């Protein structure tokens, strides 16, 4: 098994999301020593309001 799960803020390009998954998947295949074809990756997106730092939301500001 090798599975990756990204949790990120909304509002990135389609193209950027596809780059993360391609580069992260190759990096993981190579390092953990697993065929690339077995690597799963899941993206989960979050509104600015549901990511907080120091208790206050990214929506600030």
């Amino acid at each position: 098994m090798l599975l990756l799960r990204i949790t990120m803020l909304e509002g990135r390009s389609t193209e950027q999301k596809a780059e993360l998954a391609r580069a992260l998947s190759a990096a993981a295949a190579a390092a953990f020593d697993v065929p690339l074809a077995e690597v799963r990756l899941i993206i989960q997106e979050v509104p600015p309001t549901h990511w907080t730092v120091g208790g206050i939301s990214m929506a600030e500001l």
């Binding site: 098994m1 090798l2 990120m8 950027q16 780059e19 990096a27 953990f32 697993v34």
Partner: protein
């Protein structure tokens, strides 16, 4: 951003391999979405085979 990694296998990686991975993940995020160095919240979990589907035919 947060990256969770779940690995399970007969030959898990040593510290040095994981830290090469961590540095590379960090740089990928900074290259693609501009995440500043040091901000990626990264969690690697080494999952024991007995706690995955491979537990069916261990030998």
């Amino acid at each position: 951003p947060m990256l969770e990694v779940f690995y399970s296998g007969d030959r898990p990686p040593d510290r040095t391999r994981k830290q090469a991975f961590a540095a590379e993940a960090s740089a990928i995020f900074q290259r693609v979405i501009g995440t500043p160095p040091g901000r990626l919240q990264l969690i690697i979990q080494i999952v024991s085979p007995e706690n995955t589907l491979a537990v069916i035919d261990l030998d």
